[PDB]
Amino acid sequence: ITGRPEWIWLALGTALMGLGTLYFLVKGMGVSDPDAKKFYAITTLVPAIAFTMYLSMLLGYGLTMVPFGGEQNPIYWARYADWLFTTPLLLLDLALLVDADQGTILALVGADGIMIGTGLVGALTKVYSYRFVWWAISTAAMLYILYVLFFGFTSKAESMRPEVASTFKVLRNVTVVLWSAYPVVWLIGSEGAGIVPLNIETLLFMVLDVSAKVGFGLILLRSRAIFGEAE
Amino acid sequence: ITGRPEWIWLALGTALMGLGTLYFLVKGMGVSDPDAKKFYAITTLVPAIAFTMYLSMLLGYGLTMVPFGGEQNPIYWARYADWLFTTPLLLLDLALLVDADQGTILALVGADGIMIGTGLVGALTKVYSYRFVWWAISTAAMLYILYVLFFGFTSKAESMRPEVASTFKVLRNVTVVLWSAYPVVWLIGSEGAGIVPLNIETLLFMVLDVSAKVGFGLILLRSRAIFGEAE
Amino acid sequence: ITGRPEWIWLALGTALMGLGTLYFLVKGMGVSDPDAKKFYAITTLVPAIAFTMYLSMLLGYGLTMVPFGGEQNPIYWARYADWLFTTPLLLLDLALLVDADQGTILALVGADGIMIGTGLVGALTKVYSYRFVWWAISTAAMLYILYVLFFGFTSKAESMRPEVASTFKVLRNVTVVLWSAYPVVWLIGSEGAGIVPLNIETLLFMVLDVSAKVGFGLILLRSRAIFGEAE
Ligand SMILES: CC(C)CCC[C@@H](C)CCC[C@@H](C)CCC[C@@H](C)CCOC[C@@H](CO)OCC[C@H](C)CCC[C@H](C)CCC[C@H](C)CCCC(C)C
Ligand SMILES: CC(C)CCC[C@@H](C)CCC[C@@H](C)CCC[C@@H](C)CCOC[C@@H](CO)OCC[C@H](C)CCC[C@H](C)CCC[C@H](C)CCCC(C)C
Ligand SMILES: CC(C)CCC[C@@H](C)CCC[C@@H](C)CCC[C@@H](C)CCOC[C@@H](CO)OCC[C@H](C)CCC[C@H](C)CCC[C@H](C)CCCC(C)C
Ligand SMILES: *C/C=C(C)/C=C/C=C(C)/C=C/C1=C(C)CCCC1(C)C
Ligand SMILES: *C/C=C(C)/C=C/C=C(C)/C=C/C1=C(C)CCCC1(C)C
Ligand SMILES: *C/C=C(C)/C=C/C=C(C)/C=C/C1=C(C)CCCC1(C)C
Ligand SMILES: CCCCCCCCCCCCCCC
Ligand SMILES: CCCCCCCCCCCCCCC
Ligand SMILES: CCCCCCCCCCCCCCC
Ligand SMILES: CCCCCCCCCCCCCC
Ligand SMILES: CCCCCCCCCCCCCC
Ligand SMILES: CCCCCCCCCCCCCC
Ligand SMILES: CCCCCCCCCCCCC
Ligand SMILES: CCCCCCCCCCCCC
Ligand SMILES: CCCCCCCCCCCCC
Ligand SMILES: CCCCCCCCCCC
Ligand SMILES: CCCCCCCCCCC
Ligand SMILES: CCCCCCCCCCC
Ligand SMILES: CCCCCCCCCCC
Ligand SMILES: CCCCCCCCCC
Ligand SMILES: CCCCCCCCCC
Ligand SMILES: CCCCCCCCCC
Ligand SMILES: CCCCCCCCC
Ligand SMILES: CCCCCCCCC
Ligand SMILES: CCCCCCCCC
Ligand SMILES: CCCCCCCC
Ligand SMILES: CCCCCCCC
Ligand SMILES: CCCCCCCC
Ligand SMILES: CCCCCCCC
Ligand SMILES: CCCCCCCC
Ligand SMILES: CCCCCCCC
Ligand SMILES: CCCCCCCC
Ligand SMILES: CCCCCCCC
Ligand SMILES: CCCCCCCC
Structure with a gap:
């Protein structure tokens, strides 16, 4: 395992998702409110899934070699098996918060599926120049x-409770900044132009993943917006 | 890319799904009605997905070699990654139209999953005779x-509005004819008996795909049946 | 096909799922009640799916070789493609019975996905000792x-009708005993410690699968609890 210089960030990533998982699980034990049970379920599953994928990477199962640029x-x-399942869960947390209509939910999930799916094709593509065509399509998704998280949700949030409006605003600004970092890291790391080496690329995705998953989860689950208005 | 004689139909297929996608996306911009937002989301995702899969085929990513009949x-x-996701979306468009009960929706989607899944096993199977066993099972699904689109839906349609009844009738006759062509092409093309060569087989699936996706989408989204009855 | 000594149990498994499928399908023909249509759809799909996977195993498509312990x-x-789809369907049958809240449903399905997904990684893992780490995680899921089927459902059941309470109790005791056998067989069979040979391991999974699928289905679908309370 220690054979790869990036092992330390995978091990740390694995550790933080595990602890994130346990914390949310224990914390959600004293929850009976049907609405809150939804947010806790969605938000505990996210790092549990990431935990398993970080572990598969650490143990070397979640790694393959791809020939391009005349190199293996x-x-x-x-990472993409992770994101395939956890990014729609995150979107679902946001969508439920503002009581998104079903059409908009299906559009977000579908586009997210396209974004991760094309990114994975981009990562596995043997023809160097074509890799960035898939990058561009994923980035467009x-x-x-x-766009929808801004001009279809933000103006839905303030028609709702103030605590769901303020929490959503924060989670929306956190999401847009963090998510936008992902295609930049890809483009400059070993999957793309290869300016930044794999061990720093792995560190960067690890920081973003823990922030996007456990960090987001902590902001969300300490808000009263996950609970229905009850006396 | 031009190495394969079927490249022209993949390129054309790619182009038409892209334009189909853009047209539906722009057209759905001026939509606020919650019901219509569902149909537009479902129906824009269909060619967007097909677009990505046609592109992966064009670039050669979505192609593998399978040994049977002593040949590669x-x-x-x-094609099956495409259909796996787009055929249930199409079924969902029909099912929502006639307000299908949930049990029937789950049965349609499940059977559709079996149909595409067994077809893919059939396509990848190394023992020639066994390929047609999977064909038969998929065709039975x-x-x-x-059957359900006829004797469980058609008699549901006319209890509903006339505009949803007339639109569903048309989309049901379009679906049954187009869908039935797919197992015939498979059986006579390179995956099956191999009477029709790959470049014509690719043309035939391309015509059916654009018709089934963009054509169906156009009939649906110009109908007033996608909108709730509103003053 | 007869090349492998376990072929007889795959053939028998295939046969029983097929007959189970046909029986449920015919039996659900005379059903109009919207609630009952859900249970019949869910419960017919289960052995239909298993049928296709048992057949793929019988024909040799659903088999790969994995190097560990210095052996292929x-x-x-x-088996895991089967279980990936059929175990959440089974859980859904239970959850619908007791009218589980959505949060709890998503938590069960998510954990079940983790359980099957990690088990599959465990089965395909080339480093012998690591296989049991994935076993432990799957078993924890x-x-x-x-736990939830006991301390989140059983106390939900008795607030509901007596016929849904008594049926759920039985299906809950049947599920817990049968499901618990699966990780034991894995650990002692060829995927794990390898004390019991593959042909007996295949027999054991075949008995459990038919019991868990067709047996469970028969108990469920002969109960009046699947029907809404109607005059
Ligand atoms: C509503 C939303 C969900 C919409 C979804 C958006 C989606 C359509 C966008 C594209 C998804 C599509 C790219 C998924 C492709 C998965 C593929 C990378 C799996 C690996 O197979 C690729 C090659 C090796 O490079 O296999 C070598 C050749 C082998 C013979 C491969 C044959 C097996 C095929 C992979 C079967 C395809 C099955 C489905 C793609 C399963 C989906 C998995 C997941 C990654 C989407
Ligand atoms: C409710 C509905 C959804 C019901 C669904 C109906 C469904 C059950 C019907 C059958 C689906 C099943 C055939 C899917 C099989 C996918 C398989 C073709 C992927 C390619 O792997 C096959 C061989 C190469 O030929 O892999 C070489 C050996 C490798 C070691 C493969 C090991 C990985 C396995 C493929 C893991 C299986 C995961 C799931 C099948 C993912 C589903 C993908 C999609 C195609 C259904
Ligand atoms: C909400 C719930 C659903 C939560 C789900 C829980 C889930 C996260 C738990 C873990 C699931 C994850 C392990 C699935 C991995 C599938 C994998 C075994 C497929 C076979 O690929 C593994 C190796 C060969 O050993 O491929 C050789 C290398 C190849 C290049 C492989 C590259 C293709 C990748 C497999 C793409 C991944 C796509 C998704 C994993 C599709 C999911 C399939 C299904 C098995 C979950
Ligand atoms: C928990 C994980 C999260 C929130 C990951 C988000 C990842 C993305 C938004 C990735 C996007 C990508 C592109 C837009 C194109 C390049 C490839 C990707 C997949 C990195
Ligand atoms: C947009 C794509 C559509 C509508 C595709 C529909 C495809 C089918 C109905 C395919 C059916 C098949 C069989 C019935 C058996 C042979 C294999 C298939 C997958 C071609
Ligand atoms: C119809 C099939 C059923 C009900 C199968 C159930 C299977 C399980 C509960 C399997 C569990 C496993 C573990 C808990 C760890 C070892 C690997 C598995 C997948 C056998
Ligand atoms: C959104 C972040 C993208 C930029 C990340 C900056 C990382 C810089 C690390 C130094 C680069 C290493 C180059 C020499 C090895
Ligand atoms: C549903 C359509 C199935 C039949 C399609 C007919 C295609 C005929 C093309 C001519 C066959 C080419 C044979 C010589 C290359
Ligand atoms: C839950 C059942 C696990 C135990 C199953 C017992 C099977 C015993 C079969 C005899 C073992 C064969 C050893 C010599 C080949
Ligand atoms: C390809 C994987 C997509 C499914 C991811 C799991 C999360 C699904 C969210 C569903 C939202 C509900 C839509 C009505
Ligand atoms: C195997 C992929 C199946 C999912 C395809 C995506 C479409 C799902 C449609 C869900 C219909 C809603 C059922 C209640
Ligand atoms: C990874 C496959 C998960 C989907 C399995 C199909 C069954 C889905 C059950 C959905 C239950 C409804 C949740 C609201
Ligand atoms: C176009 C919608 C406005 C809100 C999204 C901001 C986009 C930021 C660009 C992200 C960088 C991707 C490389
Ligand atoms: C049996 C249901 C009647 C409506 C379906 C028509 C079936 C047409 C056969 C399609 C050709 C498949 C090869
Ligand atoms: C801890 C919840 C109590 C109900 C579940 C019983 C667990 C039985 C152990 C199963 C054996 C797995 C190897
Ligand atoms: C080898 C690099 C060639 C440049 C490819 C750029 C593709 C960018 C596509 C953006 C639409
Ligand atoms: C090599 C061709 C052998 C014929 C196989 C026909 C199988 C058809 C199954 C229909 C039930
Ligand atoms: C729910 C009614 C089903 C009647 C049988 C339909 C005929 C097709 C069966 C193919 C397996
Ligand atoms: C080669 C066998 C080594 C023993 C591995 C045991 C792992 C068990 C993990 C339970 C937490
Ligand atoms: C509870 C902490 C779980 C962390 C397990 C993985 C850490 C990597 C150890 C090398
Ligand atoms: C807007 C048109 C998009 C079509 C892109 C793919 C066409 C193939 C070009 C070779
Ligand atoms: C109706 C019985 C279906 C059983 C088909 C598979 C049995 C295996 C025969 C060798
Ligand atoms: C993206 C940064 C999130 C910060 C998490 C802080 C958790 C304590 C509230
Ligand atoms: C299956 C044929 C569909 C025809 C599409 C016509 C679009 C214009 C209304
Ligand atoms: C797990 C054992 C199930 C027994 C099935 C009996 C079916 C007849 C009621
Ligand atoms: C990681 C264990 C969490 C301990 C309880 C935290 C407060 C609910
Ligand atoms: C007003 C919300 C501030 C959120 C900024 C978060 C940057 C990661
Ligand atoms: C809305 C602010 C976006 C910041 C993007 C940062 C990507 C590194
Ligand atoms: C492909 C661009 C579509 C232009 C607008 C069509 C009328 C809404
Ligand atoms: C009355 C509807 C006619 C539909 C026929 C469509 C043939 C593709
Ligand atoms: C109901 C008409 C079916 C026509 C099938 C045509 C297949 C080429
Ligand atoms: C396997 C065929 C079933 C015959 C009818 C059983 C009683 C509904
Ligand atoms: C009271 C229910 C008894 C169920 C026991 C089933 C054992 C497989
Ligand atoms: C609650 C009884 C569990 C029995 C487990 C049996 C596993 C072989």
């Missing part, structure tokens, strides 16, 4: 999702 | 879906 | 699901 390139495919 | 046979596995 | 080990990966 280490590609951690498990991402921009659609961010 | 080009199999476009991405298909026949179940068509 | 036959691993039937199709399983224990979470059983």
Whole structure:
């Protein structure tokens, strides 16, 4: 395992998702309110899933070699198995918060599926120049999702309770900044232009992942907005 | 890319899904009605997904070689990744139209999953005779879906509004004819008996796909049945 | 096909799922009640899916070789493709019975996904000792699901009708005993410690699968609890 210089960030990533998982699980034990049970379920599953994928990467199962640029390139495919399942869960947390209509939910999830799916094709593509075509398409899907999180949700939030409006605003600004970092890291790291080496690329995705998952989860689950208005 | 004679139909297929996607996306911009937002979301995702899969085929990512009949046979596995996601979306458009009960929706989606899943196993199977066993099972699943679209939906449609009844009738006759063509093409093309060569097989699936996706979408989204009855 | 000594149990498994499928399908023909249509759809899909996976195993498609312990080990990966789809359907049958809240449903399905997903990673893992780490994690997910089926459902059941309470009790005791057998068989069979040979391991999973699927289905679908209270 220690054979790879990026092992330390995978181990740390694995540790933080595990602790994040346990904390949310224990904290959600004293919850009976049907609405809150939804947010806790969605938000505990996120780092539990990430935990398993970080572990598969640490143990070397979630890693394949991809030939391009005349080199065998280490590609951690498990990142995309992670994101495939956890990014729609995160979107669902946001969408439920503002009581999004079903059409908008299906559009967000579908676009998110396209974003992660094309990114994975981009990561596994053997023809160097074509990798960035898939990058561009995935990034376009991402921009659609961010548009809707701004110009279809923000103006839905303030028609709702103030505590769901203020919490959503914060989670929306946290999401847009963090999510936008992901295609930049990809483009400059070993999957893309290869300016930043794999061990720093792994560190960067690890910081973003823990922030996006456990950090987001902590902001959300300490808000009273997850509870129905009850006396 | 031009190495394969079927490249022209993949390129054309890619182009038409892209334009179909853009047209539906722009057209759905001026939509606020919660019901219509569902149909637009479902119906824009269909060619967006197909667009990505046609592109993966064009660039050669969605293609593998399968040994049978003592030959290496080009199999476009991405067709099934496409259909896996877009055929239930199409079914969902129909089911929502007639306000299908949940049990019937789950049965349609499940059978559709079986139909595409067994077809993919059929396409990748190394023992020639066994390929047609999977064909038969997939075709049986298909026949179940068509039965329900006739003797569980048509008699649901006319208890509803006339504009949802007339639109559903048309989309049901369009679906049954187009869908039934798919197992015939498979059986006679390179995946099956191999009487029709791959480049014509690709053309035929391309015509059916654009018709089934963009054509169906156009009939649906110009109907007033997607809107709730509003003053 | 007869090349493998376990072929007889795959053939028998295939046969029983097929007959189970046909029986449920015919029996659900005379059903109009919207609630009952849900249970019949969920419960017919279960052995139909298993039927296809048992057949893929019988024909040899659902089998790969995995190197560990310095040996090429036959691993039937199709078991997990089966379980991936059928175990949440079974959970859904239970959850609908007691009218589980949505949060609890998402938590059960998510944990079940983790349980099957980590089990599959465990089955395909090349480093012998690591296989049991994935076993432990999958088994922990399983224990979470059983906890909820006891201390979040049983006390939901008796607030409901007596016929849904008594049926759920039986299906809950049947599920907990049968499901718990699965990680034991894995640990002692060829995927784990390898004390029991593959042909007996296949027999054991076959008995459990038919019991868990067709047996469970028969108990459920002969109960009046699947029907709404109607005059
Ligand atoms: C509503 C939303 C969900 C919409 C979803 C958006 C989605 C359509 C966007 C594209 C998704 C699509 C790219 C998924 C492709 C998965 C693929 C990378 C799996 C690996 O297979 C690729 C090659 C090796 O490079 O296999 C070598 C050749 C092998 C013979 C491969 C044959 C098996 C095929 C992979 C079967 C395809 C099954 C489905 C793609 C399963 C989906 C998995 C997940 C990654 C989406
Ligand atoms: C409710 C509805 C959804 C019901 C669904 C109906 C469904 C059950 C019907 C059958 C689906 C099943 C055939 C899916 C099989 C996918 C398989 C083709 C992927 C490619 O793997 C096959 C071989 C190469 O030929 O892999 C070589 C060996 C490798 C070691 C493969 C090991 C990985 C396994 C593929 C893991 C299986 C995961 C799931 C099948 C993911 C589903 C993908 C999608 C295609 C259904
Ligand atoms: C809400 C719930 C659903 C939560 C779900 C819980 C889930 C996160 C738990 C873990 C699931 C995860 C392990 C699934 C991994 C599937 C994997 C075994 C497929 C086979 O690929 C593994 C290796 C060969 O050993 O491929 C050789 C290398 C190849 C290049 C592989 C590259 C393709 C990748 C497999 C793409 C991943 C796509 C998704 C994992 C599709 C999910 C399939 C299904 C098995 C979950
Ligand atoms: C918990 C994980 C999160 C929140 C990950 C988010 C990841 C993205 C938004 C990734 C986007 C990508 C593109 C937009 C194109 C390049 C490839 C990706 C997948 C990195
Ligand atoms: C947009 C794509 C559509 C509508 C595709 C529909 C495809 C089918 C109905 C395919 C059916 C098949 C069989 C019934 C058996 C042979 C294999 C298939 C997958 C071609
Ligand atoms: C119809 C099939 C059923 C009900 C299968 C249930 C299977 C399980 C509960 C399997 C559990 C496993 C573990 C808990 C760890 C070892 C690997 C598994 C997947 C066998
Ligand atoms: C959104 C963050 C993208 C930029 C991240 C900056 C990382 C810089 C690390 C130094 C680069 C290492 C180059 C020499 C190895
Ligand atoms: C539903 C359509 C199935 C039949 C399609 C007919 C295609 C005929 C093309 C001519 C066959 C080419 C044979 C010589 C190459
Ligand atoms: C839950 C059941 C686990 C135990 C199953 C017992 C099977 C015993 C079969 C005899 C073992 C064969 C050893 C010599 C081949
Ligand atoms: C390809 C995986 C997509 C499913 C991810 C799991 C989360 C699903 C969220 C569903 C939202 C509900 C839509 C009505
Ligand atoms: C195997 C992929 C199946 C999911 C396809 C995506 C469409 C899902 C439609 C869900 C219909 C809602 C059922 C209640
Ligand atoms: C990874 C596959 C998960 C989906 C399995 C199909 C069954 C889904 C059950 C959905 C329950 C409804 C939740 C609200
Ligand atoms: C276009 C919608 C406005 C809100 C989204 C901001 C987009 C920021 C660009 C992200 C960087 C991607 C490389
Ligand atoms: C059996 C249901 C009647 C409506 C479906 C028509 C079936 C047409 C056969 C399709 C051809 C498949 C090869
Ligand atoms: C901890 C919840 C109590 C109900 C579940 C019983 C667990 C039985 C152990 C199963 C054996 C797994 C190896
Ligand atoms: C080898 C690098 C070639 C440049 C490819 C750029 C593709 C960018 C697509 C943006 C639409
Ligand atoms: C090599 C061709 C052998 C014929 C196989 C026919 C199988 C058809 C199954 C229909 C039930
Ligand atoms: C497996 C193919 C069956 C097609 C005929 C339909 C049987 C009647 C089903 C009514 C729900
Ligand atoms: C080669 C066998 C080594 C023993 C591995 C045991 C792992 C068990 C993990 C339970 C937490
Ligand atoms: C509770 C902490 C769980 C962390 C397990 C993985 C850490 C990596 C150890 C090398
Ligand atoms: C807007 C048109 C998009 C079409 C892109 C793919 C066409 C293939 C070009 C070779
Ligand atoms: C109706 C019985 C279906 C059983 C088909 C598979 C049995 C295996 C035969 C070798
Ligand atoms: C994206 C940064 C999140 C910060 C998490 C802080 C958790 C304590 C409230
Ligand atoms: C299956 C044929 C569909 C025809 C599409 C016509 C679009 C214009 C209304
Ligand atoms: C787990 C044992 C189930 C027994 C099935 C009996 C079916 C007849 C009621
Ligand atoms: C990681 C264990 C959490 C301990 C309880 C935290 C306060 C609910
Ligand atoms: C007013 C909300 C501030 C959120 C900024 C978060 C930056 C990561
Ligand atoms: C709305 C602020 C976006 C910041 C993007 C930062 C990406 C590194
Ligand atoms: C492909 C662009 C569509 C232009 C607008 C069509 C009329 C809404
Ligand atoms: C009355 C509807 C006619 C539909 C026929 C469509 C043939 C593709
Ligand atoms: C109901 C008409 C079916 C036509 C099938 C045509 C397949 C080529
Ligand atoms: C396997 C065929 C079932 C015959 C009818 C059983 C009684 C509904
Ligand atoms: C009172 C219910 C008894 C169920 C026991 C089933 C054992 C498989
Ligand atoms: C609650 C009884 C559990 C029995 C487990 C049996 C596993 C072989």
